[PDB]
Design a binder for this molecule. Sequence first.
Ligand SMILES: Cc1cc(C)c(S(=O)(=O)Nc2ccc3c(c2)nc(CCCCCCCNC(=O)COCCOCCNC(=O)C[C@]24C[C@H]5C[C@H](C[C@H](C5)C2)C4)n3Cc2ccccc2)c(C)c1
Length: 259
Amino acid sequence: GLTEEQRMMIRELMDAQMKTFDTTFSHFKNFRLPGVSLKVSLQLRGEDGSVWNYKPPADSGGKEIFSLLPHMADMSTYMFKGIISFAKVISYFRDLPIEDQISLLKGAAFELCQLRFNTVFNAETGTWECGRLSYCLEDFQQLLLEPMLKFHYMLKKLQLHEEEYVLMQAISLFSPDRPGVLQHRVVDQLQEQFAITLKSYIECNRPQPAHRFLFLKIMAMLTELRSINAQHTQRLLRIQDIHPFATPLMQELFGITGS
Ligand SMILES: Cc1cc(C)c(S(=O)(=O)Nc2ccc3c(c2)nc(CCCCCCCNC(=O)COCCOCCNC(=O)C[C@]24C[C@H]5C[C@H](C[C@H](C5)C2)C4)n3Cc2ccccc2)c(C)c1
């Protein structure tokens, strides 16, 4: 019930997503593993049927608390590469000046990573199911006090379509107010078009009373996700200051100069 401009925009996004989101994590390899606030266990299922499980340590006032950071840095880096590839496939993004492309990716990389991670989040088991890797929240309502955690549960409950997730990714990517953006007006117009497309998609394909105000719920979540991004970017920089762990790609995305 959309225009073709809107149908072609969704098709392009869905194409970009299909080409650049390794949903089985098959090519995530050669990552570090822990030596032999909220914590996760890590499970690795081998192609032969073997399983390794890692249960994290407790806080004893020592560096043990950072044992998973190298692994997570490798996972995040793998995800960020996918997010960068996604953006670069999209015509509207490719047409932007390269400095704005970089500014938009620096601004949105965390948000797009979290949106992709929500599609592999199992809310029944509190587990991000990443192909052969599984990350399980360690033991309740104290968990939902963490804003990013409550975000994942609340977004999962909306039961969004693939198309709605990829429009969320576009709206986040084309945010006209990230630091360093110059083509503010063009980006702002592109964002509005993606939001209108999402509003119309929901109107045409979700007539049920449960999906009343769904478009507005999604937009409020995107606003909330940007606020969480700012908080978590500061958390990353504090930990990096006392315990370096960011990969080069993470340093580039989060504004660490190397000097
Ligand atoms: C320090 C840090 C910060 C950022 C910003 C990143 S990032 O953006 O570049 N990648 C990333 C990847 C995935 C993220 C993820 C971030 N935020 C989530 C959402 C679920 C968790 C919400 C936050 C919980 C509160 N804690 C923190 O805010 C910082 O805790 C540092 C101290 O750690 C204590 C021991 N806990 C761990 O070792 C486990 C991890 C797991 C993950 C989040 C958090 C920091 C890292 C990465 C270690 C705690 N997910 C979803 C998801 C989680 C696990 C597996 C798969 C998906 C990085 C890399 C690092």
